[PDB]
Amino acid sequence: SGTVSCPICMDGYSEIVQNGRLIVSTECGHVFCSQCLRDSLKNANTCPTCRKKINHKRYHPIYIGSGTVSCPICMDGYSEIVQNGRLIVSTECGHVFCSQCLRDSLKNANTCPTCRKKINHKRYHPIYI
């Protein structure tokens, strides 16, 4: 609930990218460093946090700036997002928003607010940081 971290090695955001790894999310919305998820995929094809099958590249990088997440559209922080009943979400292109902001932005255009890549309701999912 503080800084994003990897539950396997237990390194924080800073320490993850500082040595050349990425922050990645599974499609089921579970966050890991790239080295830990890769080494995990090597031993089983299931998510370490919820056991859903993540074989065949059902994960992707996410791009967060601070280590502390926030929605760049409404500008609320994690706490404010969650206490309201909103979810934290990532597009498949790795861009993070609160769920209500991304929905509303999609009523107006079918592009990612951050990178303009084509998206729809089926191309973003919650993440559970």
Binding site: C74, C101, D104, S105, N108, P113, R116
Partner: protein, 151 residues
């Protein structure tokens, strides 16, 4: 509510501006109305506009940030994509808007447009013709308009 999420975002942008002022602009409420701002932009250095200070109005719509801010020059400026009413024909102010863009980034984008005009689909055809035909004449006009209206 209605406008409340807009109000909070605009106040956040204003606070970020007052906290970390950018090199390229100043902007803030006209009056005690957060939805109506005055802004200023500096002419880019090493350009026909250098030394100029250009005033703009920003009107945030009620469903900001999902709809774009309405931004117009109040200072006269010579440019093929900005007319004499100050209207700016710029895609990020209409169909290519993103809610992730802040007013500061839009003002910087506008500054950038000054020396990167689109003369092919212009708002002011006569100025575009001069831009394509005789660039020196164009630069001379831009420089003299800067001198006359923006200093």
């Amino acid at each position: 509510g209605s406008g409340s999420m807009a109000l909070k975002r605009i106040q956040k942008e204003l606070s970020d501006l007052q906290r970390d002022p950018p090199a390229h602009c100043r902007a803030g409420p006209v009056g005690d109305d957060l939805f109506h701002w005055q802004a200023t932009i500096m002419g880019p250095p090493d350009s026909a506009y250098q030394g100029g200070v250009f005033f703009l109005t920003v009107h945030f719509p009620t469903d900001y940030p999902f709809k774009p801010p309405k931004i117009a020059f109040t200072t006269k400026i010579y440019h093929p994509n900005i007319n004499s009413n100050g209207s700016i024909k710029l895609d990020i102010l209409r169909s290519q808007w993103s809610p992730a863009l802040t007013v500061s980034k839009v003002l910087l984008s506008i500054c950038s447009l000054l020396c990167d005009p689109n003369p092919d689909d212009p708002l002011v055809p006569d100025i575009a013709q001069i831009y394509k035909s005789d660039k020196e004449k164009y630069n001379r006009h831009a420089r003299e308009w800067t001198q006359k209206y923006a200093m």
